[PDB]
Amino acid sequence: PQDLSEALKEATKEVHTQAENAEFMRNFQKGQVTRDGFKLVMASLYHIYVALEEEIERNKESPVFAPVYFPEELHRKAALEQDLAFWYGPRWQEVIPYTPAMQRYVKRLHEVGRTEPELLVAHAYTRYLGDLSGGQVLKKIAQKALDLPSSGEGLAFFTFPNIASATKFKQLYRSRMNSLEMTPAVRQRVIEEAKTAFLLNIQLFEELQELLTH
Ligand code: HEM
Ligand SMILES: O=C(CC(c1ccccc1)c1ccccc1)Cn1ccnc1
């Protein structure tokens, strides 16, 4: 496919199905989630977005990422910090878990950030465009299963307040990915790193399930 947006969607089909048939998400679809499990997800998303956004800020000026840079529209660190404060208490930053599977993901983002930033779009595509697609339904499932209090906190991550229409922004975000100047050789590594990105996610759900069910 000529468009990067199409080429990434085409390449990741087998790895996305592999991620749908992850043991954790197999249960999540049927609404078989616990508070413990959700907390782990929420903590995972924190460590990943902290690293992703840290590396994005390093490379916002660079032509390899500048077009897809949407700080205000997409930033998730603060939303997640608000949630972890509710899930783990005001001393969340001292008590939240940092598992090896999380560490691998975080290590990759920091390596891609410093040594090959032209691939950072692959992770940005995976994380943002991924979490922008599923959030609405995944919240509806979580909300039903967890039966949390009327405290008005803890699910802030699932709302992108500076994005009016998710569908229109995804359109826009795809256009900006299509406008990225890159040799058909880097084009290869972006697709390969996107595959790597999915692998790290599935690998995470596997370590999470090994922890939750003893
Ligand atoms: C419960 C497990 C999952 C299900 C049922 C699922 C299914 C879906 C659905 C229904 C969409 C909406 C399609 C759209 O309107 O664009 C989507 C999009 C997407 N998902 Fe998932 N998914 C799951 C897990 C994952 C994981 C673990 C990742 C990797 C981080 C991922 C990455 C993506 C991406 C990048 C898109 C946007 C595709 C595009 O438009 O280019 N998904 N998926
Ligand atoms: O699956 C998605 C987010 C998912 C998740 C969590 C941690 C790491 C990677 C993914 C998650 C978020 C919040 C609660 C339960 C699960 C986005 N998605 C939906 C459809 N296609 C992509």
Numbering used by the authors: 10 to 223
Paper text:
The heme oxygenase (HO) system comprises two active isozymes (HO-1 and HO-2) which are involved in the regioselective, oxidative cleavage of heme at the α-meso carbon. Cleavage results in the release of equimolar amounts of the gasotransmitter carbon monoxide (CO), ferrous iron (Fe2+), and biliverdin, the latter of which is reduced further by biliverdin reductase to form bilirubin. Of the two active isozymes, HO-1 is a ∼32 kDa stress protein found to be predominantly expressed in the spleen and inducible by a variety of stimuli including heat shock, heavy metals, heme and reactive oxygen species (ROS). Our laboratory has been focused on a program aimed at the design of novel, non-porphyrin based, isozyme-selective HO inhibitors based on the structure of (2S, 4S)-2-[2-(4-chlorophenyl)ethyl]-2-[(1H-imidazol-1-yl)methyl]-4-[((4-aminophenyl)thio)methyl]-1,3-dioxolane (azalanstat), which was discovered as a potent and selective inhibitor of HO. This program has resulted in the discovery of several novel, azole-based compounds, deemed QC-xx, which selectively and non-competitively inhibit HO without affecting NOS or sGC, except at high millimolar concentrations, and do not induce expression of NOS, sGC, or HO-1.
Thus, to exploit this putative interaction, we modified our strategy and QC-308 was designed to contain two phenyl groups which would occupy both hydrophobic pockets simultaneously. Diffraction data were obtained to a resolution of 2.85 Å. In contrast to previous native and complex structures of hHO-1, the data were assigned to the P212121 space group with larger unit cell dimensions. The two molecules in the asymmetric unit (A and B) were virtually superimposable with a Cα RMSD of 0.391 Å (upon alignment of all atoms). In brief, the inhibitor binds to the distal side of heme in the heme-binding pocket with the imidazolyl group serving as the sixth ligand of coordination with the heme iron i.e. the anchor for the binding (Fe–imidazolyl distance = 2.1 Å). The western region of the inhibitor fits into the hydrophobic pocket which extends back towards the distal side of the heme binding pocket with the distal helix shifting outward to accommodate this region. Thus, it appears that the two hydrophobic pockets serve as a “double-clamp” to stabilize the two phenyl groups in the western region of this compound and increase the stability of the complex, making for a more potent inhibitor than those previously designed.
